[PDB]
Amino acid sequence: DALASVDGNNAHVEGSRAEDGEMKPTVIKSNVTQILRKVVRVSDTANTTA
Amino acid sequence: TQMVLRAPKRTELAKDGSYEKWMIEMEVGLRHRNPYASGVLFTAAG
Amino acid sequence: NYGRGRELMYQLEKKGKEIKRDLEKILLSGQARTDVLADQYLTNSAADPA
Amino acid sequence: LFVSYDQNGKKLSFANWISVLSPQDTPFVSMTGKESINQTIFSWQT
């Protein structure tokens, strides 16, 4: 969310009862996830060898 | 020396049905002790 | 909402910051005088409302 | 409109602390020295 733009020069009578003023809403920014994978396959003989 | 008479307050504005209005006030003010104490330089090309 | 527990205080802080910015801008603006709404100040005894 | 500027009272307050500092000392002209004489004309030799 950002704020209003350059203000100023909005001269108004004391009893003007301005039109409820202005404003700006928020914004949604979305993304997505990712999956990283790593596989390993080793035999028991190779797991036991020194 | 910017002199503030009314500090920022919070109040309600005129009839608004069910809008539940809100309003903030202030009082603009600035005093310059001596004019030639500060100068100004506007930009201009050749 | 999700990122806002209450909207009133949120908009109030937004408006406070906006009015601060507006004041800082108008105090350093450079426009000229435009016949202030006064009623011939310096002996404006006879005012002219409406 | 009803500016509501009647306010026939017109306190017309003013802020203290003038804070004036502009100096015009020029010391060296007050330190070059001084010599008292007793005539409207003074002559020296070269």
User: Across the interface, which of A7, A13, A26 has its CB nearest the CB of C22?
Assistant: A7
Sign of CA dihedral C42, C45, C49, D3: positive
Q: What is the rounded distance in angstroms from the CA atom of residue A8 to the CA atom of residue C22? A: 5
Q: What is the rounded distance in angstroms from the CA atom of residue B22 to the CA atom of residue B14? A: 10
Method: cryo-EM
Query: Cβ contacts of residue B32 below 8 Å, gap of 6+?
Result: B38
13-42 in chain B: CB under 8 A from chain C? 20, 22, 24, 26, 28, 30
What is the per-residue burial (b if ≥16 Cβ within 10 Å, else e) of B22-34?
eeeeeeeeeeeee
The Cβ-side half-sphere exposure at D25, using a 13 Å CA radius, reads 5
Q: In chain A, whose CA is at the least distance from the CA of D4?
A: A14
Structure tokens at C8: 């009133």
Touching partners of C (3+ C-beta pairs < 8 Å) = A, B, D
Closest by CA to B24, choosing from A28, C9, D23, is: C9
Cα separations in angstroms, D37 against C35, C47, D33, D41: 64, 69, 13, 9
Q: How near does any CA of chain B get to the CA of C50, in Å? A: 20
Q: CB–CB of C11 and B22 under 8 A?
A: yes
Q: What is the rounded distance in angstroms from the CA atom of residue C31 to the CA atom of residue C17? A: 23
Query: Cβ contacts of residue B38 below 8 Å, gap of 6+?
Result: B32
Structure tokens at D12: 């017309």
CB C48 within 8 A of CB D9: no
The Cβ-side half-sphere exposure at C45, using a 13 Å CA radius, reads 1
3-state secondary structure (DSSP) of residue C26: helix
Query: Cβ contacts of residue C46 below 8 Å, gap of 6+?
Result: C39, C40
Q: Resolution in A for the shown PDB structure? A: 3.4
| Residue C50 sits at the chain D interface (C-beta within 8 Å) | yes
Closest by CA to C24, choosing from D19, B6, B26, A15, is: B26
Write the single-letter amino acid at B37.
Answer: A
